[PDB]
């Protein structure tokens, strides 16, 4: 007995690569579980969406050791009906409750099954990359077992002991399903269908696996292609499934691409993003702002520019986007003017790449004061030696967040956010969580992760890469993952799922 009925919701199981075996004791057992699901929904619809004794229901279904028989009758009527249904199955034991370890599966479990989970030891099936392992007892007994055709495996199905009524086909040959279906005699078989990709790369430390929400036709990549080829599609639609640091770099090439199941976005990420979109739409809110934190080196401006464009197009309003080095490039010009400007077009004109930041100058002077000039010099230090310098960098950071002066950062975001000509909806980037007291008043702050080894992106660039790596490590030491973590495809899916107008 599954948490979600396969005879009713067959298409959801087809998404996981699981096809029902055609119509034996397993065949009788799945119909018995369907009858139990229908009976449970009927009994739960009568009392506030709940079950009146979930330990009793759990014992009767999963253990199969309880008979309730009329010899109040009203309080036990539903249990007598369930008892006469389970007694007639004549099973030697009970039906174990079966859950997949996917989040998209767990969101679709009915309420009464969730009420039964608390009084049952369920059978939890692990998922490797969103795909449940096909070698489980129940998934082998109830579903068709998949068979993978590759470029070396490929032959007619009579070479193996394959039959239409037992096996399903995973085409991983790099060829069309019609060509395999008419040219190798796979006409009567059913092919499993995946919509994303899984790529294995070459890493600094090994090999790196990446799940992508694009098809292999749309993502125009082959084995051997460079990491910088089709980089923006990978950035907008990819998630690296390895531990940090995963040594992906600009020198990475593709070892293998296979079709894989698409990722589903997280619930809390979509929740906080839809909270922001509700603030964008509503007329009761004067100013709406999204604060996005990211590690220094993640390529977050390139995504958030496109995000701001798509939000302007789907919304019909003007979206402003300050960079994460906005206050630094402002203060590197205006730290001596007694009454400097806070106009949005001036601050926006100072957000270019060819303006140096104030904190970069202070960190570069701090590195010169310790004789540090090179990446090889900086990497060669111990951890205590680095932390002793990052404490001095925190001393130069604290002076700009401690008060509300005219050159303070809190006043900077105040005079930009509450200006006349500034747009209503802003997207502001930050480097670390202590700016939560300093960036303008929001209710939605997220943390962004990309497909970027930030410490490898910083060592593979110019214009003071030592200062860049030093600031990355300082900001990492000040930025935990204490806000909700959001990927770029989740931020695009948030705009696509919001019903507009």
């Amino acid at each position: 007995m599954f948490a979600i009925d396969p005879l009713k919701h067959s298409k959801l199981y087809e998404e996981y690569g699981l096809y029902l075996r055609p119509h034996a004791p397993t065949i009788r057992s799945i119909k018995y579980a369907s009858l139990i699901h229908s009976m449970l929904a009927k009994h739960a619809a009568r009392h506030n969406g709940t079950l009146i004794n979930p330990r009793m229901y759990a014992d009767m279904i999963t253990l199969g050791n309880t008979k309730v028989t009329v010899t109040d009758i009203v309080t036990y009527k539903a249990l007598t009906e369930m008892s006469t249904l389970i007694e007639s199955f004549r099973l030697p034991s009970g039906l174990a409750l079966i859950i997949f370890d996917d989040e998209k599966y767990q969101s679709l479990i009915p309420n009464y099954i969730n009420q039964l989970i608390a009084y049952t030891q369920p059978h939890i099936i692990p998922t490797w990359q969103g795909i449940a392992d096909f070698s489980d007892t129940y998934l082998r007994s109830y579903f068709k077992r998949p068979f993978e055709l590759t470029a070396s495996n490929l032959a007619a199905p009579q070479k193996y002991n394959l039959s239409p009524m037992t096996r399903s086909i995973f085409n991983n040959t790099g060829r069309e399903d019609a060509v395999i279906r008419k040219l190798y005699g796979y006409g009567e078989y059913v092919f499993i269908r995946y919509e994303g990709c899984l790529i294995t790369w070459t890493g600094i430390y090994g090999e790196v696996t990446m799940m992508v929400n694009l098809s292999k036709r749309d993502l125009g990549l082959d084995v051997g292609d460079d990491y910088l080829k089709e980089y923006k599609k990978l950035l907008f639609y990819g998630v690296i499934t390895d531990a940090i640091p995963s040594g992906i770099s600009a020198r990475s090439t593709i070892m293998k691409i296979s079709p894989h199941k698409m990722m589903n976005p997280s619930g809390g990420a979509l929740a906080v993003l839809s909270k922001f979109l509700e603030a964008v739409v509503s007329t009761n809110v004067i100013n709406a702002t999204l604060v996005v934190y990211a590690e220094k080196g993640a390529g977050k401006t390139s995504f958030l520019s496109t995000y701001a464009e798509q939000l302007s197009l789907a919304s019909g309003q003007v979206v402003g986007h300050l960079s994460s080095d906005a206050y630094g490039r402002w203060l590197a010009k205006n730290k001596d003017v007694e009454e400097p400007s806070f106009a949005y077009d001036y601050v926006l004109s100072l957000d270019t790449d060819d303006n140096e930041s104030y904190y970069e100058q202070k960190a570069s002077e701090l590195l010169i004061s310790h004789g540090i000039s090179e990446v090889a010099q900086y990497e060669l230090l111990s951890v205590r030696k680095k932390i002793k310098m990052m404490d001095e960098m925190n001393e130069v950071l604290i002076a700009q967040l401690e008060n509300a002066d005219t050159h303070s950062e809190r006043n900077f975001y105040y005079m930009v956010s509450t200006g006349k000509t500034t747009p209503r909806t802003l997207i502001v980037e930050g480097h670390f969580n202590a700016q939560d007291a300093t960036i303008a008043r929001t209710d939605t702050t997220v943390l962004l992760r990309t497909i970027n080894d930030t410490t490898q992106a910083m060592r593979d660039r110019q214009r003071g890469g030592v200062v860049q790596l030093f600031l990355r490590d300082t900001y990492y030491r000040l930025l935990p993952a204490l806000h909700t973590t959001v990927y770029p495809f989740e931020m695009l899916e948030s705009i696509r799922r919001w019903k507009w107008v």
Binding site: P54, L397, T418, R477
Partner: protein, 1208 residues
């Protein structure tokens, strides 16, 4: 005619010619406002300008009544006092005023078109000036001012004291009052537009200054100094200037006590006893005397120079510790106002809840184990303050995890909702719909939980809650800012429940928290009383300014490491929607992903710690929806106090361990923490104590907090209770007899007297003259609470009026042509103030028939059923026991008007009030919601109780549903749920059912006597043998340990006679508390015990069904069987008195402490429960009459009917 010329004002006793006169004059002040304007603004009072007299310590002082021009001639309204930003999305960032600026009341003009920002702004400023200022506790504000002025007139017997000239110079504008309030419009309507804007708060200010004079804290010249300082603070903005110099005007007392030099102080034992007195030095160390320079300079440049000159006078002319105590209480009366500080929450929001960064940035722990979303499951600090806190906290994790494993957390969550939720309310009534159909309108968390109970196990509930905003709701308290507190729904409350449950367990493993001691008596201050009697001790009341705004996200991560350690060590399946399972996971060092077994609690704690959003959203009428910046602490949360307590005790004790590992000693003896309040006590040399205190201050600064270090040799502060050298300096100006937090009608007015008696008992040991406070409470009961109006039927009008006017005085109306059932005004007699279930207020001497007087009932007299003995004391109880009668003299009781009060409390006329009527949901829906709510934790306890209740029902023994445990949750849902969002007010009237008993009970109406009130017939004769005093009577004669316990006073002499309070001196505990109250907790006047004793006297086979229906455990089962056994044998006598711990603060709770004082002849001991009963008699009589007690031994005489009732 006039109150300062009555014969009560000169004798302070009630004869028959004096009680009727006070009744007439207080009725004349309570009825009409023409007499109130005549009383407050009589022509015969001459305006005094210069004045002379004594200070609080008896030194001659001279002051002059001065009122500035800005109060009499207010400025016009300036719109730049409340600026906006350029976007006009909120008020300006640095804006000077957060409270009501003083201007002319007609100068504020809303000339703007509606649906405009300036229109909303001026409507809100109208609401600020007209609605936020009416804060009255009992009646209208002029009636409260009449009560204060009447009390001062009767006490001082004259009308020439400076507060009259202040009232006339501030409020006499024409022939009517300059303003008034209406409960129909709920605002202050101005009559004179030329008057100032802050001027309606000065009625309450004058009420507080008169309360301070009645207290003995301020003299008349000191009242001049106080009122001049308050008008000086009101010269520009009253609340802002009060808050700006609130600490400078108080903190001089340490320098004053330094310059005293020597003090002879009492000495406290470990075991709550005064064991001696010593003569110590009160000079301060050199690091304390360096702060005096900055305090002197800031005091000279900030304060009003009359108040500054008073402070320098107090610095010079003090010679004892009691001198500094008296001047300090005077400056507390001079700087605190009593009113609750309140304006628009948009003005105070940027100072109450806006986050801030101090000293330095807090970094992160190294993440050791991590989720597939890269969210932290396990983490550890490299070095810094997180490492220092975890070095102490990590030794507690395994014991706490063992404790957490043995808790059922679903039943704990349901008990947390039914009992002691932190916000206590959802702050507003909300709509409750699940499947496209609304269920109820409610604001209770338990009906909200019963509605959405089908998704308690569903994981999408948490992510749905992450989409909802966190609500903001404001607060009032006096001498403090507005303090916006947050409110959040049940699921954000559910995410913070397991961190609360984990951090709550550490209180049972240490002694460095203060939760165990809030009992309302002197046990709360016992450790400070012990450690301030010690020598070579350094006291530290270290204060962290604004802690909830100072806790950043990284500061939250310090407590999160401790929570994740305990959560990883434990084994808890099935917490919420979570269940224990294998989980793909990351680890440092490991390049691939591992699989670990993760229980439910660690999933919940990691998901809470990884998804953190603090920012409260306020819905404003001006600006729409206002959000906050992030990085505050919400404080309407489950783990709000435990977070700050755990974090501060971890930083302090880990600094102790860190100093030990660096090679330095610790001199720290104890710390006590309750969240934002730290109390450190160091003992040793000045070098070591200064080093350790500076290291604790620096390690708090390294954690991101700003600290003010008030550290002393001889004074300590915790939980607004100041102890100075074994002596409690109470704060009398923190209790407001006149203002409230919310505007609320009273209605019942027995509840009003109970509230007044509780506030009077709270002001009892923190006051200097309790007798004037008794007179002040008598007049606020005689003027403020004396009016009752009730709608009466037209055909039933005359026969109700004529029947009720024989015992009371009633004010009638002319006709009612337009409508039916006009309302009749009746005023209650003054005898209602002193009755059981009436006022229960301490009484003055009533004259008997012989010319003798009853006793002036002191501030320690018992309430409850013991007030019925005054009916017999007026009836000459000594004469009534010397000719063996029980006849109440109903004639003398009629001439004082006690019989009208007893007829009134008998006929329940004061219950007929207006009632807010709720429109309920269907009872099938109520049963459905409660049945669904029972399925969430500990299945089967309530349906067995319902089954056993039905089993008792069918055998002919029905139980009420508020006692049956399977019910009651049905009752709670039935009370707090509605089927609509609006409620109506239903008034009540007299009809034929009530008119019948009006006619029946008012023919003769003798006062009834039960057979059981023969126990009141006892008296005490005075022998010529002087009792011996306790040996601590000499140790408290130097430097009194309360403001009312000075040498010679009645509190001092009561302590010298009865002794102190003790937790282990329970000589008779069962036999005393039986005839007084309960058995252990079950009182005999509970429906539980009454129905149980009914089924006990019946067949015993139904008894176990009673135990199952009540669903009590076996220990309570045995206690309650022994309760029935003790009621069946020797349960006939019972006495039922009520005291309070704030009332008997330093004094003993045990009636056995009076057995050494009264000689009882042994021929009266005729039963096993005579001894405790007579001890209660002697104890309550000695506390009731301390004022005439001169130290003689008493001899008790009894009535033969009392002996006959105790025998059987």
């Amino acid at each position: 005619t006039e109150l300062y010329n009555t014969i009560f004002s000169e004798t302070r006793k009630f004869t028959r010619e004096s009680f009727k006169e006070i009744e007439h004059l207080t009725a004349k002040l309570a009825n009409d406002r023409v007499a109130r304007h005549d009383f407050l603004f009589n022509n015969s009072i001459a305006l005094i300008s210069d004045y002379s007299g004594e200070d609080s310590n008896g030194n001659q002082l001279q002051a002059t009544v001065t009122i500035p021009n800005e109060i009499t001639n207010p400025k016009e309204y300036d719109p730049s006092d409340y600026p906006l930003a350029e976007d006009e999305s909120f008020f300006k960032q640095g804006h000077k005023y957060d409270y009501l600026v003083t201007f002319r009341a007609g100068s504020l003009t809303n000339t703007y078109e509606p649906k405009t920002k300036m229109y909303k702004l001026h409507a809100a400023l109208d609401k600020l000036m007209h609605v936020k200022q009416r804060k009255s506790r009992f009646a209208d504000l002029w009636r409260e001012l009449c009560a204060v002025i009447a009390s001062l007139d009767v006490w001082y017997q004259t009308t020439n004291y400076p507060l009259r000239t202040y009232v006339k110079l501030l409020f006499h504008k024409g022939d009517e009052f300059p303003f008034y309030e209406s409960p129909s419009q709920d605002k202050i309507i101005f009559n004179d537009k030329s008057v100032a804007s802050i001027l309606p708060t000065f009625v309450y200010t004058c009420c507080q200054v008169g309360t301070a004079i009645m207290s003995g804290i301020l003299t008349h010249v000191e009242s001049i100094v106080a009122m001049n300082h308050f008008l000086h603070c009101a010269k520009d903005s009253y609340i802002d200037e009060k808050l700006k110099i609130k600490g400078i005007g108080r903190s001089w007392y340490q320098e004053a006590l330094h310059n005293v030099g020597r003090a002879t102080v009492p000495v406290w034992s470990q075991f709550n006893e005064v064991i001696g007195h010593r003569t110590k030095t009160t000079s301060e160390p050199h690091f304390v005397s360096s702060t005096f320079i900055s305090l002197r300079a800031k005091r000279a440049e900030l304060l009003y120079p009359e108040f500054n000159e008073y402070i320098n006078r107090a610095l010079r002319l003090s010679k004892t510790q009691n001198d500094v105590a008296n001047y300090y209480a005077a400056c507390r009366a001079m700087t605190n106002d009593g009113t609750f500080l309140a304006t628009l929450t948009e003005l105070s929001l940027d100072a109450a809840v806006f986050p801030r960064i101090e000293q330095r940035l807090v970094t992160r722990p190294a993440v050791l184990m991590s989720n597939t979303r890269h969210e932290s499951l396990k983490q550890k600090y490299a070095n810094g303050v997180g490492s220092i806190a975890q070095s102490y906290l990590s030794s507690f994790t395994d014991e706490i995890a063992k404790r957490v494993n043995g808790i059922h957390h679903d039943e704990a969550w349901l008990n947390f909702l039914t009992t002691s939720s932190p916000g206590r309310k959802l702050t507003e009534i909300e709509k409750l719909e699940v499947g496209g159909d609304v269920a109820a309108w409610s604001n209770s968390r338990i009906v909200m939980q019963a509605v959405f109970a089908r998704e308690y196990r569903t994981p999408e509930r948490i992510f749905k809650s992450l989409k909802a905003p966190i609500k903001l709701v404001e607060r009032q308290q006096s001498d403090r800012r507005q303090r916006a507190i947050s409110g959040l729904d049940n699921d954000r409350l559910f995410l913070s429940f397991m961190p609360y449950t984990i951090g709550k367990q550490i209180y049972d493993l240490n002694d460095n928290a203060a939760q165990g001691k809030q009992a309302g008596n002197a046990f709360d201050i016992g450790e400070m009383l012990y450690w301030t009697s010690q020598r070579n001790v350094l006291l530290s009341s270290i204060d962290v300014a604004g802690m909830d705004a100072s806790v950043t996200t990284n500061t939250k991560d310090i407590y999160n490491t401790f929570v994740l350690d305990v959560a990883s060590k434990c084994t808890v399946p099935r917490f919420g929607p979570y269940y224990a399972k294998n989980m793909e996971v990351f680890e440092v060092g490991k390049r691939q992903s591992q699989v670990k077994y993760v229980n439910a609690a660690w999933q919940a704690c990691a998901l809470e710690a990884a998804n953190s959003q603090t920012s409260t959203s306020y819905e404003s009428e001006i600006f729409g929806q206002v959000k906050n910046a992030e990085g505050t602490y919400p404080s309407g949360r489950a783990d709000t106090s435990t977070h700050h307590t755990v974090l501060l005790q971890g930083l302090v004790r880990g600094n102790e361990l860190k100093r030990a590992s660096d090679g330095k000693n610790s001199c720290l003896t104890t710390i006590k923490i309750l969240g934002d309040d730290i109390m450190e006590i160091f003992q040793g040399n000045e070098n070591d104590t200064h080093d350790h205190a500076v290291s604790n201050a620096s390690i708090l600064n390294e954690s991101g907090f700003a600290t003010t270090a008030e550290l002393s040799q001889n004074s300590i502060v915790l939980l607004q209770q100041l102890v100075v050298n074994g002596t409690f300096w109470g704060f009398a100006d923190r209790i407001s007899l006149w203002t409230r937090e919310d505007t609320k009608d009273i209605g019942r007015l027995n509840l009003a007297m109970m509230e007044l008696n509780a506030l009077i008992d709270d002001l009892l040991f923190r006051v200097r003259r309790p007798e004037g406070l008794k007179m002040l409470g008598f007049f606020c009961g005689a003027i403020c609470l004396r009016r009752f109006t009730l709608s009466v039927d037209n055909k039933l009008y005359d026969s109700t009026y004529n029947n009720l006017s024989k015992y009371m005085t009633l004010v009638k109306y002319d006709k009612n042509p337009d409508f039916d059932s006009t309302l009749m005004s009746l005023i209650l007699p003054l005898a209602w103030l002193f009755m059981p279930r009436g006022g229960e207020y301490p009484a003055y001497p009533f004259e008997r028939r012989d010319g003798t007087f009853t006793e002036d009932e002191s501030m320690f007299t018992a309430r409850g059923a013991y007030k019925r003995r005054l009916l017999y004391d007026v009836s000459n109880i000594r004469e009534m026991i010397q000719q063996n009668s029980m006849v109440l003299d109903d004639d003398l009781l009629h001439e004082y008007g006690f019989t009208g009060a007893l007829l009134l409390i008998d006929l329940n006329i004061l219950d007929l009030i207006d009632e807010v009527k709720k429109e309920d949901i269907s009872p099938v829906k109520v049963n459905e919601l409660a049945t669904s709510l029972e399925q969430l934790g500990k299945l089967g306890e309530r349906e067995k109780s319902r089954r056993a209740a039905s089993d008792l029902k069918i055998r002919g023994h029905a139980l009420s549903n508020d006692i049956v445990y399977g019910y009651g949750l049905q009752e709670k849902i039935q009370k707090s749920a509605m089927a609509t969002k609006e409620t109506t007010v239903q008034s009540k009237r007299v009809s034929s059912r009530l008119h019948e008993v009006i006619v029946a009970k008012t023919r003769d109406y003798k006062i009834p006597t039960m057979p059981a009130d023969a126990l009141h017939l006892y008296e005490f004769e005075v022998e010529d043998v002087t009792v011996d005093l306790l040996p601590h009577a000499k140790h408290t004669s130097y430097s009194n340990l309360a403001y009312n316990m000075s040498f010679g006073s009645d509190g001092w002499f009561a302590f010298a006679l009865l002794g102190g309070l003790d937790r282990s001196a329970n000589l008779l505990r069962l036999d005393v508390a039986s005839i007084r109250g309960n058995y252990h907790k079950f009182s005999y006047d509970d429906p539980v015990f009454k129905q149980g004793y009914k089924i006990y006297k019946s067949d015993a086979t139904l008894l176990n069904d009673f135990f199952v229906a009540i669903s009590a455990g076996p220990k309570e089962q045995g206690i309650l069987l022994r309760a029935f056994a003790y009621y069946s044998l020797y349960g006939n006598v019972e006495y039922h008195y009520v005291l309070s711990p704030r009332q008997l603060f330093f004094l003993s709770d045990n009636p056995v402490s009076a057995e050494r004082l009264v000689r009882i002849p042994p021929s009266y001991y005729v039963s096993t429960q005579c001894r405790a009963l007579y001890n209660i008699f002697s104890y309550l009589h000695i506390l009731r009459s301390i004022t005439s007690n001169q130290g003689k031994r008493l001899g008790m005489v009894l009535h033969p009917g009392l002996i006959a009732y105790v025998r059987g």
